[PDB]
Known about the structure:
By secondary structure, the chain is α/β, with parallel strands linked by helices.
Amino acid sequence: AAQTNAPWGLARISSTSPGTSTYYYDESAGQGSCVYVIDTGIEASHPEFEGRAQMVKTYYYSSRDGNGHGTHCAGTVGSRTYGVAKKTQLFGVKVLDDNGSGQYSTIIAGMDFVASDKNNRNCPKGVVASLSLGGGYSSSVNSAAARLQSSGVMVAVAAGNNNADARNYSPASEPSVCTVGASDRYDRRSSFSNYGSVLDIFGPGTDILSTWIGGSTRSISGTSMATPHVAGLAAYLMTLGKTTAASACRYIADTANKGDLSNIPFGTVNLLAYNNYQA
């Protein structure tokens, strides 16, 4: 399948070169997989989700996304125009309030919620969780991310936006989950992207067009935007039967575009997520 005039990040993940604008992918498109977006919520009514999104949990007075961040991330995972895995099922878990903040205890509860809740959903091709959130190092937060992964969910987490070593952030620093740095459309490390040995992969994170609340769209930047590219990619590859929740991060690293990013610090992987789709 070919989507013309796609957002640059989608085109990038199906290309061996920067500078193209068409996204190529197998038409299976993550059908039969599920991605949990653990964030500020998802505006499921957005036409871009086509009825494939739903809120399953909130820790606040509403399950609505009053912020936008979660809706943008979910759009990059799975919206019809802005998404990597255009036929996945999207499940929203609102651990972040409408100001984008959340207590670590709530975030932990949301991770453990997903590990159990997947048993209430139909995801024959597999389950992914996208965590575009984080804070300072916490062993309890890392352990929750590790449990979620152990339970059979492909966990993708943002590296963080401090232009610093991600070893000092959680859940970024958890070794058993897939930690995602950000790049720009010229294959440069994004200016704000964290780095370090704990990173597993880079994805598009600068100037990413996706869904927003009020049935709208906008372009924003962050490792929050790179993470759902990787989560959507995992769902897509799992639907194709190429990998599993436990092995997908390694598979994505194995099949990445290698050595193509600039300003990668010595000791950080130079790997850019790539679907290796041959039309």
